């Protein structure tokens, strides 16, 4: 094979041909786009991989960045699927490129995937991120990169040169710059790069929108179940320092200044040491909160994500946003009182009232009473089934849905063309219980065409459903519109607007246009709630 | 007729035999129960009527207490029906007694009606308060009273012995004492007195529940579209004094309190009426200048506090509301509202109407009201904004104060029955966007449909006859669903948990749950916590 040998600016790669039931795909896995961020480079921004000699073995995924492996439910596919499938290493800044086996003679749009793991986990090597089907079915170019998570990518001592923070986002930006310079060698169009990511990956995508230096690296953006303005995606410079300085004490860290000496001590500790003390850094007991996330230091983000969203012009931009039907149901079993995968999680009102403070941390008691007011059925205020689904909405609306709805309504009203969805599909018998519905991150495998894998046991209707979803994403990446242009008979997906608030439902049934993305609930979170903290 | 001459402790009376389609009824109208509160007695507690020589003419209604006359819709039946239909005079402390024509042999339950006109208006002489069909179809003594309204009945200079306030409620109390000593002369049972009133009259009934001296003057209570814990039914002694002095400065009037009241007595009655509404702090709706005051005498504490810990075990109470409590009020102040046009307000007029429907609250508080009551899928829809503001005024002032009262009486041992009147009268002159507006169930409670002069509907006539039996079954037994009918649905008591009420309309009884539970949780629970923390 000669199509499996490509010469990028840094050197030569030896790719591998992947077998899809519809045809072959040329893959280049484990391409270094940065020098190994080890030793003095830990906590520092990445710098480009210098030109190498020989041919880089690009036939398998490289190492997973050091992260906390969740040991909640061992041997359970619903949680094991997100754990690292490669060895952990600080030498992890590698990217992957899928391209059609007949290398495209004409430049095709490029889809760049940014994985989400709450900014503390994740890897581009996970099986649900395999881009062989999305490429073979729609003849596009799929790129996915690893970026430093946890303290290795987002520990910030704001101001200091040795730990500026947001270096995990700079890993992504450097990978995007690598695409602009080298994706043409694989048949991709650098002027037609579409970002798409889920959860923290969607928040990352949203931050490249609000970061001027990154805006010139991509054309369109897709945010799946995540937004940069979420209550979990950023921290202030004060909290970032209080969290970094605490981690140094947990690991025993007393012309170097005190910040320079703090980082120098943190760089002596083995990577696994810093991981074991990560979750001990969070202020209080909480759910859907993470220790080291992007920081509003000023460099990467001129202001908070909310401030950049409001006072921003987004003309000439197409954005695709969406959420799953049951966002917060997963995060309840992890930390909420009385919740479990195995016992139906019927909760009392005392457990509900306690779960509100865990799901909505660092708010006044008056604010918590406002949350209890809206999410209580005061005719049946102690029904365990209603209380279980109410707290699932509390975490879902507060963390994902309403940040997404706030972003979409703002982008659509300030120049952008926005399309919105709600993934409502759930298998007949899923590994998770029924009360959790369509949980966080369940749309990824269908978007990536995983049902087309012959080794998996998906319904033949689910394979058709996946191919339709791949068409929507490819059509958006190609034209900025998920609809088929030469097909006025197909169910129309109208753009989301701040007034009509139209979105479609994604399931086995044809597209159904719905109105209002939790409009009544998100008016509380996005409008009334913030004015409560200021007044009280 | 020998059934028309009755003697009370004050003296002899001479009644009139009123005629109903079902039979005759003996009536005694304009019975003086207090000395005329004129001159120096203005703003003072009522003095008992001293006995008289001869026979008092009790064949016609007496004068209406001086009050504001609604002139914004001249000639309109919907508003004129509440305007005073007799001569205005400060000599108005009179009551009316209706009794079945063959005076009952055994003691009979007594119904005592307290009219409600926001404490600024009303009269027992109105046509809808005509107690002849209720007294004939159920044979229960009906007594109605006139109490001082406006400044003459509720102007309060706290601490002053010249204007202690609540003298209009003391007018009602003195009438109840008159019932306790004289209703037996008409065949009534003093030990089985049931109070019932609407609006300010319902609030007045609730305040007699919360005032220990009145608890010995009645046995059961009915509160229709009103409650003493409403945001409009009481004021503090500080606000009562600022409104009292403000009225003095607007009429040109200067201990310093004694000379202030003396000057107000010199002013003509109509002069005070002309300046009553001007003493209100902000432009508002469903707000009245002179209401009962929390002075420590009549109301030892605020009504909401007297409800939490009170003597309520064994007390039979009947409460209820209409389907559209706040629609009627919006034509008196709300921007963009009129009975002539559909009142399809814009959002700018909706937000402005919230500040006039919910006055005297902070900016943050008003935004909480903009939430909940805004359909954020159609926040610009004028038909929704109009119907939403109707809920805001109805819930904040009537529905939720009633739900709070009913739930807390039941939790302390009271047998509470709740209803929702939702039949729009066919003879109703108000527009259709008002639905079943405030105060339009009194016609059916008093059996006004039975009047052959009125052109009511055939099935509205049996509907009224059914409501009269419900109210009568409450006065006699304390249980409206007294008929042991397995063919007719039962009326379950209202409890704090189940929160069951019945709907009143042409259709038979429908038992529902939740008297605006999601909305009243905001008004009765969250909003107070928001005001004390802002
Ligand atoms: C519904 O009707 C109301 C009531 O207005 C009166 O009755 C109507 C049937 C017509 O005969 C009107 O000419 C009549 O005034 C109207 O509501 C509007 O309320 C606003 C308050 O926001 C007032 O507007 C201002 O008021 C004065 C007095 O006219 C002027 O100085 C100003 O120019 C301004 O109009 C006003 O009372 C009234 N509108 C007008 C035009 O006077 C309104 O017409 C209508 N409202 C709806 C459908 O929302
Ligand atoms: C501000 C006011 O002055 N405070 C008093 C007030 C009372 O003065 C008004 O009722 C006067 O109209 O309210 C209280 O009223 C009680 C009244 O003093 C007491 O006395 C009754 C009543 O006098 C009755 N009338 C007869 C015809 O003369 C007489 O029989 O004697 C007494 C009953 O045996 O009775 C109480 C119960 O009815 C009240 O009416 C009320 O306590 O607030 C007293 C206030 O001091
Ligand atoms: C449902 O389960 C939760 C979670 O508890 C875990 O899973 C249970 C099935 C059982 O194996 C527990 O021991 C596990 O810790 C239960 O909530 C916990 O209850 C236990 C028992 O004392 C205790 O550790 C904590 O108070 C609870 N902890 C948390 C995090 O919720 C819950 O009681 C179960 N609910 C029902 C209705 O059975
Ligand atoms: O497997 N049987 C069912 C199943 N359930 C899911 C959702 C459950 C996990 C919730 N979501 C995440 C947890 C941890 N890490 C993540 C990282 C990226 C995206 C999502 C997550 C997804 C695919 C599946 O097939
Ligand atoms: Cl398992
Ligand atoms: Cl998997
Ligand atoms: Cl996660
Ligand atoms: Cl912060
Ligand atoms: Cl801070
Ligand atoms: Cl901390
Ligand atoms: Cl913690
Ligand atoms: Cl988590
Ligand atoms: Cl949803
Ligand atoms: Cl948000
Ligand atoms: Cl456009
Ligand atoms: Cl078409
Ligand atoms: Cl067509
Ligand atoms: Cl289409
Ligand atoms: Cl079309
Ligand atoms: Cl909605
Ligand atoms: Cl919705
Ligand atoms: Cl909603
Ligand atoms: Cl909803
Ligand atoms: Cl009017
Ligand atoms: Cl007259
Ligand atoms: Cl009124
Ligand atoms: Cl008695
Ligand atoms: Cl009593
Ligand atoms: Cl009694
Ligand atoms: Cl209030
Ligand atoms: Cl008050
Ligand atoms: Cl005097
Ligand atoms: Cl006079
Ligand atoms: Cl005079
Ligand atoms: Cl006011
Ligand atoms: Cl008044
Ligand atoms: Cl009893
Ligand atoms: Cl009693
Ligand atoms: Cl209702
Ligand atoms: Cl008006
Ligand atoms: Cl007014
Ligand atoms: Cl108020
Ligand atoms: Cl709500
Ligand atoms: Cl209690
Ligand atoms: Cl009428
Ligand atoms: Cl009947
Ligand atoms: Cl309800
Ligand atoms: Mg080569
Ligand atoms: Mg292909
Ligand atoms: Mg662009
Ligand atoms: Mg925000
Ligand atoms: Mg934030
Ligand atoms: Mg520790
Ligand atoms: Mg997690
Ligand atoms: Mg966790
Ligand atoms: Mg907390
Ligand atoms: Mg917070
Ligand atoms: Mg309800
Ligand atoms: Mg759920
Ligand atoms: Mg605002
Ligand atoms: Mg007048
Ligand atoms: Mg204020
Ligand atoms: Mg409540
Ligand atoms: Na499993
Ligand atoms: Na298992
Ligand atoms: Na996990
Ligand atoms: Na899977
Ligand atoms: Na996740
Ligand atoms: Na095709
Ligand atoms: Na927030
Ligand atoms: Na935040
Ligand atoms: Na925030
Ligand atoms: Na945060
Ligand atoms: Na956080
Ligand atoms: Na924070
Ligand atoms: Na801290
Ligand atoms: Na290490
Ligand atoms: Na930990
Ligand atoms: Na933790
Ligand atoms: Na904790
Ligand atoms: Na959690
Ligand atoms: Na967590
Ligand atoms: Na555009
Ligand atoms: Na664009
Ligand atoms: Na947790
Ligand atoms: Na927080
Ligand atoms: Na926090
Ligand atoms: Na706060
Ligand atoms: Na509510
Ligand atoms: Na609600
Ligand atoms: Na709700
Ligand atoms: Na939120
Ligand atoms: Na749009
Ligand atoms: Na599975
Ligand atoms: Na399970
Ligand atoms: Na998935
Ligand atoms: Na298509
Ligand atoms: Na199509
Ligand atoms: Na179209
Ligand atoms: Na379109
Ligand atoms: Na919006
Ligand atoms: Na939804
Ligand atoms: Na909904
Ligand atoms: Na929304
Ligand atoms: Na909701
Ligand atoms: Na907030
Ligand atoms: Na007679
Ligand atoms: Na007197
Ligand atoms: Na009428
Ligand atoms: Na008078
Ligand atoms: Na009245
Ligand atoms: Na009469
Ligand atoms: Na009668
Ligand atoms: Na008492
Ligand atoms: Na009693
Ligand atoms: Na109140
Ligand atoms: Na009010
Ligand atoms: Na005042
Ligand atoms: Na006069
Ligand atoms: Na005057
Ligand atoms: Na005014
Ligand atoms: Na006004
Ligand atoms: Na009014
Ligand atoms: Na006190
Ligand atoms: Na007591
Ligand atoms: Na009792
Ligand atoms: Na009893
Ligand atoms: Na209603
Ligand atoms: Na009316
Ligand atoms: Na007016
Ligand atoms: Na007015
Ligand atoms: Na006005
Ligand atoms: Na709402
Ligand atoms: Na309404
Ligand atoms: Na209540
Ligand atoms: Na209570
Ligand atoms: Na209605
Ligand atoms: Na008849
Ligand atoms: Na009976
Ligand atoms: Na009977
Ligand atoms: Na009865
Ligand atoms: Na209750
Ligand atoms: Na309901
Ligand atoms: Na309602
Ligand atoms: Na509350």
Please characterize this protein's 3D structure:
The structure is a homodimer. The first copy, chain A, has 536 residues and is an alpha/beta fold. Chain A has one domain: 3-Layer(aba) Sandwich (Rossmann fold). Helix content of chain A is 33%, strand content 16%. Chain A is built from 17 helices and 16 strands. Chain A has helices at residues 77-80, 132-138, 151-154, 167-182, 200-209, 212-215, 237-250, 258-266, 271-276, 305-310, 329-335, 349-359, 365-374, 384-412, 444-447, 460-479, 519-535, and strands at 5-7, 12-14, 16-20, 23-32, 55-57, 64-65, 88-89, 94-100, 108-114, 141-145, 188-198, 220-224, 318-324, 417-423, 502-506, 512-515. In chain A, the strands form 3 sheets. Chain A has an 11-stranded mixed beta sheet with strand order 3-4-8-10-9-11-12-13-14-15-16, with helices on both faces. A 3-stranded mixed beta sheet of chain A has the order 1-2-5, with no helix packed on it. A two-stranded parallel sheet of chain A has the order 6-7. In chain A, helix 13 packs antiparallel against helix 17 (519-535). The longest helix of chain A is centred in the last third of the chain and has 29 residues, at 384-412. Chain A is globular and about 70 Å long. Chains A and B meet through helix 13 and helix 17 of A and helix 12 and helix 16 of B. Bound molecules: a molecule of 4 linked components (NAG-NAG-BMA-FUC), a molecule of 3 linked components (GIV-SIA-A1AAJ), a molecule of 3 linked components (NAG-NAG-FUC), ligand A1IAS, chloride ion (43 copies), magnesium ion (16 copies) and 1 more. A molecule of 3 linked components (GIV-SIA-A1AAJ) binds at residues 45-46, 48, 164, 170, 173-174, 177, 213, 297-298 of chain B. Chain A: Glycans are attached at residues 258, 343, 457. Chain A: Pfam families: AChE_tetra, COesterase. Chain A: Belongs to the type-B carboxylesterase/lipase family.
């Amino acid at each position: 094979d000669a199509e499996l040998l490509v010469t990028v600016r840094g050197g030569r790669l030896r790719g591998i041909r992947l077998k899809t039931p519809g045809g072959p795909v040329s893959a280049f896995l484990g391409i270094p786009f940065a020098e190994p961020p080890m030793g003095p480079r830990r906590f520092l921004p990445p710098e480009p991989k210098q030109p190498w000699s020989g041919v880089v073995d690009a036939t398998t995924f490289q190492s997973v960045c050091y992260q906390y492996v969740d040991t909640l439910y061992p041997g359970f596919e619903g949680t094991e699927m997100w754990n690292p499938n490669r060895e952990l290493s600080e030498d992890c800044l590698y990217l992957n490129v899928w391209t059609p086996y007949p290398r495209p003679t004409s430049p095709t749009p490029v889809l760049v995937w940014i994985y989400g793991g709450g900014f503390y986990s994740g890897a581009s090597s996970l099986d649900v991120y395999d881009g062989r089907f999305l490429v073979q079915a729609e003849r596009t170019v799929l790129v996915s990169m690893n970026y430093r998570v946890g303290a290795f990518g987002f520990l910030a001592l704001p101001g200091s040169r040795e730990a500026p923070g947001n270096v995990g986002l700079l890993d992504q930006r450097l990978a995007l710059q690598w695409v602009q310079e080298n994706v043409a060698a694989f048949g991709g169009d650098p002027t037609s790069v579409t970002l798409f990511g889920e959860s923290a990956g969607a928040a990352s995508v949203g931050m490249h929108l609000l970061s001027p230096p990154s805006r010139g690296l991509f054309h369109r953006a897709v945010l799946q179940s995540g937004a940069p303005n979420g209550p979990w995606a950023t921290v202030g410079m004060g909290e970032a320092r209080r969290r970094a300085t605490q981690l140094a004490h947990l690991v025993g860290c007393p012309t170097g200044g005190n910040d320079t000496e703090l980082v120098a001590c943190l760089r002596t500790r083995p990577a696994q040491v810093l991981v074991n003390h990560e979750w001990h850094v969070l202020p209080q007991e909480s759910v859907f909160r993470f220790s080291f996330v992007p920081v509003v230091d000023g460099d990467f983000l001129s202001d908070t994500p909310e401030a950049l969203i409001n006072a921003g012009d987004f003309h000439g931009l197409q954005v695709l946003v969406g959420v799953v039907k049951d966002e917060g149901s997963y995060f309840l079993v992890y930390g909420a009182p009385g919740f479990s995968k195995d016992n139906e999680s019927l909760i009392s009102r005392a457990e509900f009232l306690a779960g509100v403070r865990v799901g909505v941390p660092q708010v006044s008691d008056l604010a918590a009473e406002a949350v209890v007011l809206h999410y209580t059925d005061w005719l049946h205020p102690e029904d365990p089934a209603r209380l279980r689904e109410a707290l699932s909405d509390v975490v879902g609306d507060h963390n994902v849905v309403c940040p997404v709805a706030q972003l979409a309504g703002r982008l659509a009203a300030q120049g952008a063309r926005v399309y919105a969805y709600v993934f409502e599909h759930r298998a007949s018998t899923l590994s998770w219980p029924l009360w959790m519905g369509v949980p966080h991150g369940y749309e990824i495998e269908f978007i990536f065409g995983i049902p087309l894998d012959p080794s998996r046991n998906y319904t033949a209707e689910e394979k058709i459903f996946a191919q339709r979803l791949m068409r929507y994403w490819a059509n958006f990446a190609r034209t900025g519109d998920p609809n088929e242009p030469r097909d006025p008979k197909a169910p129309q997906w109208p753009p989301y607007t701040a007034g009509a608030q139209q979105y479609v439902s994604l399931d086995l049934r044809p597209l159904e246009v719905r109105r209002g993305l939790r409009a009544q609930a998100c008016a509380f979170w996005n409008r009334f709630l913030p004015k409560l903290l200021s007044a009280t």
